[PDB]
Ligand binder design. Structure first.
Ligand SMILES: NC(=O)C1=CN([C@@H]2O[C@H](COP(=O)(O)OP(=O)(O)OC[C@H]3O[C@@H](n4cnc5c(N)ncnc54)[C@H](OP(=O)(O)O)[C@@H]3O)[C@@H](O)[C@H]2O)C=CC1
Ligand SMILES: NC(=O)C1=CN([C@@H]2O[C@H](COP(=O)(O)OP(=O)(O)OC[C@H]3O[C@@H](n4cnc5c(N)ncnc54)[C@H](OP(=O)(O)O)[C@@H]3O)[C@@H](O)[C@H]2O)C=CC1
Ligand SMILES: CCc1nc(N)nc(N)c1OCCCCOc1ccc(-c2ccc(C(=O)O)cc2)cc1
Ligand SMILES: CCc1nc(N)nc(N)c1OCCCCOc1ccc(-c2ccc(C(=O)O)cc2)cc1
Ligand SMILES: O=c1ccn([C@H]2C[C@H](O)[C@@H](COP(=O)(O)O)O2)c(=O)[nH]1
Ligand SMILES: O=c1ccn([C@H]2C[C@H](O)[C@@H](COP(=O)(O)O)O2)c(=O)[nH]1
Lengths: 518, 524
């Protein structure tokens, strides 16, 4: 029977980053600078902190007192609040207008303070706790306090805010030992005061029956997903991707492939990412975006020339443009790397007769990109703001038919959302890039129409995991996401055709190690 | 305290429809015929009945034992049967296994039974018996005389009620349940077993560390619709009937919808992005919380498949779905000044059979012009079933302004596994109160037709909604409808001799066992 369990002693803290980088939990360590917080107010962390440290559940107290008494070999302890323990320097950095911390029993560790309790050794806290009625006990820091409370093994859980930005710091949270503590929960990702952040939790290592009745009809070893399955709360939006992989692995249909690879597949999924709060660049592996952005730029120019991409070493379309690949598609009369009437051609020239990749198509066919931008600007409540690449007439002349069938747009209260329907979804290699690409695009349309981006919504049709990706995705599922990065566009660009590679910046991308999916 | 609460006395039953139109909960009331059951085995109900009457939770007995102790001062359930019920059970099934069996009788006594059973000769003796036994719950198993007297005396806490959605000859009937004594608290998924659909409803008499963590994670959490406006809807504990996928979306839009104007002038509440899934192997999802007829939508689908764009064809069969979109005034407001009345332009049927052909008029012969995508997808399903390119697309960007209006149903994608066909339809714009009920029915039918002609069985119709809206003028009608409890769905049957997609006619379709609430004008 350990003290921290008896007295419900917990740590709570907020850690920023500090000035081929490798990332780990320790990336998030920064606590303070010059007696104060490294950052200007991050008001969302403040609200979380207040609510965690003040929250009490009276009905649960009877049971805690019991345990505490039986431990201290007593029969009695002799409006419920929590205890909060601050180091002296910590207590001095708090604006006086906020001291003592409201609705909490304030305890201060100090050797040089004299009488809101003061105490001058840790063991004196245990004593004080044995003589109080309190719900739980929260160690609020600073650095010295966490250090000693942690080495003395006095901490049941760590409520750890990850501030995904870099500050100058002079004091650090200690390195949490992964054999001592493991993460059991991860929150939604949020933006506050110009940074992303998330909240994670380390742990020390009648109607009921009716529910059963309604359930009366209901080569992967899930034990391999130890970390995945041991998490309790999985609210980080990256879990929308990871959970689909889990689902396909566990419940997928075995089917054969043109490459003889084999897939597990399922049909019909939705993911939704809130672009006002973050940029959903997967963090459970490394992803690179230069190629993805050039591809989008090449679509917007309405290009179908694969050489343009190849000469910038963007090799996404290379295999689809070879002599052999075109001949197998019966495009015997197509030049190498002429991909035919694919996305760019359909976005700007839908319905025009395709000749070759060098022809001049200006003012030929339907310029649906211009059309949707005008509809957003002039008739935002239109339900016909669609951009469609599936030209049934032209499919057989494409190097391959589009995987990204259409985008539809929705405008409410100055904000833009986008649904993209994908007929075919390689969860392991394709879908991560695909989410990035259409999130970028959503931002680009929003900016040129003076709107703010809201949600990117991804509908997956035939959704598959290649059998040669399974071992890699197993490794990936047992990694814990980090808070997402942010995308910044150059704010000067007000025309969809005016963006260049230099107008795009990913900020604060923290990621696990790259994985060769094969 | 009541006797039924102390001793945990429940009823479980199964009721079919009977021969003798308005529907109500009393539609399901057939129990028995000539001393045995009205149907041959409905095995899924037998499985449910065994699961419910045999399940026990040992960890909860201690509190039960305490409660009954106060009242008076391996674990198993007790089951109680009328004598006629007992004699109806096949010998090999008696006594009911893993249960304490109790029989009510005057004419027979314990010397008349070989089996491990308790005989009781009045209800009062049941209660005495329950006071003497160790048991989890007590299930009253019928028949009609027994249900009658247990209900009359208020000795039933809940009724586990199976709705068998088919009609049989009966001579005995469950009591009419008094809606002021008993109300439905829960409704199951809908299933098919032994060629009938059925569901299961429930009437009621009228480390918690991780719990605090739940609260912490919620530290950061609209429309003047009123709470009491959904009393019945919100009083249900389990809402597992697939009709709730539709009803819950309506609720979501009412409560969280964004207010917006629209091309129509009415304004709406809107949201963006929903998915519904319907299991066509188990039911035909025609909405039951209001009345729908399918003659028109079936004639529409046949007209689509034929490649037709002539609205007169529909009007001549008294189908008016497209009438307003073909008037002189409508076409002119679309700037289609050189279009004949009821010439709807290159819409669905034209795109399905002739995508990319130049549209002239509704009378032209377009044979072998454009892409016959309907044919192409049938060929793909038959010869390349694992293709990820089996898509039928009505949104032809080039032809949009020539259409009476652009399609709402943008595309269907198909999926085949293990001899079974699934279908996703993506709907760019979705009128929840009027359009969507019919849209679900149309694409569900089309999935069955495509499956049959490719020698597959239907699996799931998946409906993806883009712009999803409730018209302000529909809100009061939808409020009414949401306080209705769905009935088990109907089934759809097709003439099995039809083996080509082009060869269906209206009499090739039958909708069987449609039970529904009354018709609702969505508008005033
Ligand atoms: N971001 C976050 O989550 C948090 C950050 N901070 C930041 O951390 C910094 C403060 O950290 P740090 O410098 O380590 O200071 P601390 O808050 O850890 O204070 C240390 C002091 O506490 C007293 N003390 C410590 N251990 C004991 C003990 N065992 N017995 C008795 N008294 C003890 C002593 O005061 P004495 O001199 O009287 O002996 C000691 O010098 C600031 O910059 C602050 O803003 C603060 C709170 C949380
Ligand atoms: N579909 C369903 O869910 C169910 C249907 N059934 C069907 O229902 C029919 C049987 O119903 P029903 O004809 O109403 O008969 P019951 O099963 O209700 O049995 C009636 C007999 O039970 C005895 N009995 C009942 N109440 C008492 C009492 N208070 N004290 C003493 N004895 C009592 C008497 O036996 P005695 O004459 O010997 O004195 C009486 O004649 C059959 O067709 C059966 O298959 C039955 C149960 C479930
Ligand atoms: C960083 C928070 C935090 N977060 C987490 N998760 N764990 C913590 N243990 C933690 O901190 C230590 C708690 C005591 C400090 O209590 C303060 C109160 C108010 C201001 C304050 C400063 C500036 C403004 C303003 O400029 O408006 C307003 C308030 C600072 C500290
Ligand atoms: C309809 C059941 C039922 N359902 C629900 N929901 N509540 C009920 N209270 C209920 O009944 C009460 C059970 C007493 C009769 O228990 C039987 C057991 C087996 C066969 C039996 C007969 C024939 C065959 C065969 O021919 O295959 C197989 C089994 C009949 C009755
Ligand atoms: O942007 C893309 C393009 C392709 N794919 C995957 C889906 C399939 O695995 C393959 C294309 O093969 P077909 O589905 O077209 O046959 O590429 C994606 O995930 N994303
Ligand atoms: O099969 C159909 C046809 C139409 N609509 C509704 C959606 C809109 O309320 C309206 C079409 O208007 P636009 O979205 O095209 O503006 O009709 C449906 O729900 N289903």
């Amino acid at each position: 029977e350990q003290v921290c369990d008896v007295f419900d002693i917990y740590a709570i803290c907020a850690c920023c980053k500090v000035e081929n980088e490798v990332f780990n939990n320790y990336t998030f360590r920064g606590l303070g600078n010059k007696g104060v917080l490294p950052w200007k107010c991050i008001s969302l962390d403040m609200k979380y902190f207040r609510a965690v440290t003040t929250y009490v559940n009276e009905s649960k107290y009877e049971k805690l007192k019991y345990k505490r008494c039986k431990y201290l070999n007593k029969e009695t302890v002799d409006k419920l609040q929590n205890v909060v323990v601050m180091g002296r320097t910590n207590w001095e950095s708090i604006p006086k207008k906020f001291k003592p911390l409201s609705n909490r029993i304030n305890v201060i560790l100090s050797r040089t303070l004299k009488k809101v309790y003061i105490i001058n050794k840790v063991e004196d806290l245990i004593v004080l706790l044995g003589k109080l009625n309190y719900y739980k006990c929260f160690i609020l820091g600073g650095s010295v306090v966490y250090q000693e409370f942690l080495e003395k093994k006095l901490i049941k859980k760590i409520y750890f805010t990850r501030i995904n930005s870099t500050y100058e710091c002079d004091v650090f949270f200690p390195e949490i030992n992964e054999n001592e503590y493991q993460i059991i929960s991860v929150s939604d990702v949020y933006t506050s005061n110009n940074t992303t952040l998330d909240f994670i939790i380390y742990k020390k290592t009648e109607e009921e029956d009716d529910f059963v009745y309604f359930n009366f009809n209901k080569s992967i070893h899930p034990n391999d997903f130890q970390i995945y399955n041991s998490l309790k709360y999985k609210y980080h939006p990256e879990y929308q991707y990871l959970n689909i992989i889990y689902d396909i692995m566990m419940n997928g249909n075995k089917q054969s492939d043109r490459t003889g690879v084999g897939v597990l597949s399922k049909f019909g999924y939705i993911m939704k990412f809130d672009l006002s709060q973050y940029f959903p660049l997967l963090t459970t592996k490394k992803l690179f975006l230069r190629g993805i952005i050039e591809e989008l730029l090449w679509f917007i120019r309405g290009e179908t020339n694969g050489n343009t991409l190849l000469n910038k070493n963007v090799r996404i379309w290379e295999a689809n443009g070879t002599r052999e690949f075109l001949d197998n598609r019966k495009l015997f009369h197509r030049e190498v790397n002429d991909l035919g009437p694919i996305y760019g051609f359909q976005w700007r020239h839908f319905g025009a007769e395709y000749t070759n990749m060098y022809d001049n198509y200006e003012n030929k066919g339907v310029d649906q990109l211009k059309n949707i931008i005008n509809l957003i600007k002039n008739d935002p409540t239109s339900r016909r703001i669609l951009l469609c690449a599936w030209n049934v007439k032209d499919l057989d002349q494409m190097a391959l038919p589009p995987c990204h069938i259409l985008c539809q747009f929705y405008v409410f209260d100055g904000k833009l959302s986008c649904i993209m329907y994908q007929r075919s979804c390689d969860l392991g290699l394709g879908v991560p890039f695909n989410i990035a690409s259409y999130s970028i695009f959503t931002h680009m349309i929003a900016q040129v129409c003076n709107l703010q981006p809201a949600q990117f919504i991804h509908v997956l049709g035939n959704a598959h995991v290649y059998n040669n990706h399974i071992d890699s995705l197993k490794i990936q599922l047992n990694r814990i996401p980090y808070p997402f990065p942010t995308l910044k566009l150059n704010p000067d660009i007000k025309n969809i055709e005016d963006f260049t590679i230099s107008d795009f910046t990913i900020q604060n991308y923290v990621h696990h190690e790259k994985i060769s999916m094969d």
